[PDB]
Amino acid sequence: DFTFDLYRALASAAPSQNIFFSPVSISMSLAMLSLGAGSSTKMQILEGLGLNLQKSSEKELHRGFQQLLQELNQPRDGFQLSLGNALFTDLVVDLQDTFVSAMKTLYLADTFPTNFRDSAGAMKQINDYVAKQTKGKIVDLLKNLDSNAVVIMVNYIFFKAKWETSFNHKGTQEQDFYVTSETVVRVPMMSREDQYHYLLDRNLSCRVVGVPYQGNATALFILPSEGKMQQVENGLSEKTLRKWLKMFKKRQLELYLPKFSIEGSYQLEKVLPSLGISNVFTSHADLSGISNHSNIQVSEMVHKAVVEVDESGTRAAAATGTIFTFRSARLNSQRLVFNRPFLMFIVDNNILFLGKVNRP
């Protein structure tokens, strides 16, 4: 698995830490990059994306993403999704019009000649570019920039959508969240009893619940059994996802989910090589589709994903202006409380987001 092996790579590199990235967005930038890559550099990228038998249609691959981008970029109401890619290339590097054209046309991405000789100027231009493309949601992508950089590739994505059903601000109270058995933090816990797509996975030992967004996206929160986080991570795979997308049944639940913001920032040139994509970062890189200039390669491939989660939804919890019972108070339903590290997916027909919430 491209996506899940990448998740494990990132996880292994930063134990006991939050992880968060966009799979679709990463595949998108790699395909886009293959547009100017040649020989073994290109082939490593395509196989990494996993590319059909007969090494068939790359243009079909670009068609898919091309359409996907369009659908993703079409506004709704209270749906905030900013995603994009850009290539910053040194002044020496003469660009190929066929590359620049394909990038803008197919992926809506830009290629900007840049003066990396002025490290501090380039960093600010890049950060300002992203701050604007994100309507201010991602303001300081790069934290440092080398003077010898030749080409910087940045991929960014910010997402915030209204729940299909809201969380009553009256159900939010501070509560303990156990990062570990001995590390505890107070967090504002939202709550709402309702019918949710539930799933008990005895194989991996974890509970999965689905919460739909006011649109076409649905959040999946995975709660491992006490001490089973590593096991679950070891079990993550596209197959498993398919499996889960079937076991899903409606179940009355009193859900307790934290209000939180989560982000991941990565230098993919330090992890992708372990997944088989290495030539593109070396001096032996083949980016002849991009320029005829020798000695060029991707100096840095940064990726930043940001997502905010809160009460806001489309409609308020309609009800029990029907609560019938002789009891003083109705009894509780099954309770699912995320007050220990959990995993989270945000999926449409693809996987927009994948991460591990260790500390809200």
From Swiss-Prot:
Major localisation: secreted
One biological process term in Gene Ontology: negative regulation of hydrolase activity
Keywords: Fertilization, Glycoprotein, Heparin-binding, Lipid transport, Protease inhibitor, Secreted, Serine protease inhibitor, Signal, Transport
Transmembrane segments: none
SMART domains: SERPIN (SM00093)
Effect of residue 202 to E: Does not change the rate of thrombin or activated protein C/F5 inhibition in the presence or absence of heparin. Strongly reduces the rate of thrombin inhibition in the presence of heparin
Activity control summary: Its inhibitory activity is greatly enhanced in the presence of glycosaminoglycans, heparin, thrombomodulin and phospholipids vesicles.
Residues annotated as glycosylated: 203, 216, 292
Annotated site (Reactive bond): 327-328
Outcome following mutation: residue 59 to E: In allele PCI*B
GO molecular function: acrosin binding; glycosaminoglycan binding; heparin binding; phosphatidylcholine binding; protease binding; retinoic acid binding; serine-type endopeptidase inhibitor activity
Pfam families in the record: Serpin (PF00079)
GO CC entries: acrosomal membrane; external side of plasma membrane; extracellular exosome; extracellular region; extracellular space; membrane; platelet alpha granule; platelet dense tubular network
Highest rank taxon of the organism: Eukaryota
Tissue note: Predominantly expressed in the epithelium of seminal vesicles. Expressed in the proximal tubular epithelium of the kidney. Expressed in the superficial and more differentiated epidermal keratinocytes of the skin. Expressed in megakaryocytes and platelets. Expressed poorly in kidney tumor cells compared to non tumor kidney tissues. Expressed in spermatozoa. Present in very high concentration in seminal plasma. Present in high concentration in plasma, synovial and Graaf follicle fluids. Present in low concentration in breast milk and in amniotic fluids.
Subcellular location: Secreted, Extracellular space
Effect of residue 314 to R: Inhibits heterodimer formation with TMPRSS11E
Assembly: Forms protease inhibiting heterodimers in extracellular body fluids with serine proteases such as activated protein C/coagulation factor V/F5, acrosin/ACR, chymotrypsinogen B/CTRB1, prothrombin/F2, factor Xa/F10, factor XI/F11, kallikrein/KLKB1, tissue kallikrein, trypsin/PRSS1, prostate specific antigen/KLK3, tissue plasminogen activator/PLAT and urinary plasminogen activator/PLAU. Forms membrane-anchored serine proteases inhibiting heterodimers with TMPRSS7 and TMPRSS11E. Interacts with SEMG2.
Family membership noted in the UniProt record: Belongs to the serpin family.
Comment, domains: The reactive center loop (RCL) extends out from the body of the protein and directs binding to the target protease. The protease cleaves the serpin at the reactive site within the RCL, establishing a covalent linkage between the carboxyl group of the serpin reactive site and the serine hydroxyl of the protease. The resulting inactive serpin-protease complex is highly stable.
Descriptive protein name: Plasma serine protease inhibitor
Organism: Homo sapiens
